[PDB]
Amino acid sequence: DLPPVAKAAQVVNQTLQLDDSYPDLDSYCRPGASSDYEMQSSDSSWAPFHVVRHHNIPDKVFEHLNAGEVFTKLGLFAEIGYAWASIDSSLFLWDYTHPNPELIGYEEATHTITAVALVPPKPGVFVKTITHVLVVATTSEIILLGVSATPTPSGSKSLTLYSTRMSVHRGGSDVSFIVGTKDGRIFLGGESDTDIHEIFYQQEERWFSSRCGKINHSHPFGSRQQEWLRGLYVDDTRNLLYSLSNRSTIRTYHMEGPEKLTKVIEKDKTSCLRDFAHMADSSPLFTDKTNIVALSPIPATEASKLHLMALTDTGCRLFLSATSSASYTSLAPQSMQLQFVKFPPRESPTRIRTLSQLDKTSRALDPSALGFRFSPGYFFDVVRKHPNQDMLFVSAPDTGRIKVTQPASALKYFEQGTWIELENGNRTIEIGLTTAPFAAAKQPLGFGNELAVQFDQVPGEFAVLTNTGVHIVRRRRLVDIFAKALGNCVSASDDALEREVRKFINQYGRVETIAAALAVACGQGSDLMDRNTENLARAAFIEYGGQPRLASVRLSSRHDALALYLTRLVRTLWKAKVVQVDISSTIPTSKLVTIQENVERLRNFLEANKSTIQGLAPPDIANQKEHQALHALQKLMESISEGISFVLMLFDERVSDIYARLDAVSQQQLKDLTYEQLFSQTPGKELAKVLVKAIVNR
């Protein structure tokens, strides 16, 4: 009744939903606490992160820095691969990915530079080629410069600066923190007070208004005690702005309009401590003596309730929710509460490899000087136990264990962690993301599924700026770990592989492990011996793939692995519309090519092992449906490749011309045609037969 490709498409749809059901952050960080870690040596194949390269500071910057009379400062523009150094009233930018960079000097400023930042531009203000705005704050004024960071053949942005005539006198309040919103709004704060200012600017000059203005959103008056800021933090997904003070007070501001900023929550350390005392597990790691050293916003795409992470100097990660009083009039929250605490790990870093209650007393992250969190939870902590050498603790969610955990009430914040040592003299200054922000889905459920996006977006990379250079740290995927582990099994027994494979099964489950073997066998991870590793991966896919059984049948883990891998290769395509009407393609052509290559390499792998892989060759009811299921998947693969080739052929011509000379029903059918329908449904095949028949006649 139902043909092969339609049967296989059913498996894809159900697999997509399974990946998009990956637990949301609120679900495994429920009210309570956790100390769950599996620590890995930094030199281990199971390390969750590792250093890939380093970039020294140019010698000319050292000449200027040691020529500093009063004040110097370093910072990162990780979004574009640039770093900067300010010396008194002079500023120098450079591309740290370049082996011998030239210094972009800017010395117009008259007074000491106190802060520098790279923010998005205000729309409809600048020429489209202006990609960013450079904000330069001195003790006398703030200066805006246009920036064009266009990519080069080498892979590092070319940076050119534009004057703007946009500037405003600073005033009496120091500026040490500058942050920008998605829409180009510029907010300022510093070490004089807790006030937050905003810089406005517009293209047109008016007789009653200048091109650039500044206002204090805090409207202070009367008696005020000493207190200033340690940082500013933006969350565009909620239109919120957070400030952290030197007294560890957390203030939340809501952008109720394009020019408004309203303080809506103020939560001091006492309030946090009161929440903490009402929790089941209190700890001497968080007291009135403890300082909060950093905040990190959590976007609404990642979690509904948990808005914010706060890091203590003892290494505790405080996760705070925020809630509005009502459900309708963005809606501003009015309350903030400490809900969940992740306590520090216990293992300390060691030169030599060392050998179930809540651990709420570890000092391993004491003192924590700097801290950063990146979605879906990558955590960097600069531990400064000694005044000369920083130690870097880096951890990630145990995505494999979180995905397999059952039932939902057993979910905990499992983590994989490691210690990265920086050499003597390296003082960490800043850590920034160099790749695109992580997102496996558009809502909390499914958002954190690292496994699903292993082959759709490169692994996250992070630039660690120190006083001596920039270190690149890269997140490692399951396939990276699996390939590395197998690389160590090349010179060992039949039982050596089985032992290493069992480690993966116990953490990730059998299907995910066999899917990783299939991926490695198909060359995934090789963008980083390699024939033997891929042959070992093939051996693991065959030997440990399981078999089909009567419970309606339960197909082998080998089959589910093939369906899982294939689904993840096309997840960006399946439910997407083929075209966007001047008609164009929803998916960029370059992305369609790589997807097709991946599908074809998978097909090539199955053909070259049609005789050795169980189920491919024809074979009692169990092995029968195993053969039918595997056959249907392979028919979907060739249909996927044909479908992609058809779309590429289509846009090589002039589709808008073809679309014009077309009937309405066929325009409408093409309007809402998805890749799924093209791959696995008759109306999609019949429509493709129309479009080709129109191209051939002209």
Binding site: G105, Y106, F126, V127, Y162, S163, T164, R165
Partner: peptide, 14 residues
């Protein structure tokens, strides 16, 4: 080398 600052005329439209 002091960075060449191209003019405002190019920068902002229209």
């Amino acid at each position: 080398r002091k960075a060449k600052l191209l003019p405002m005329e190019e920068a902002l439209l229209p």
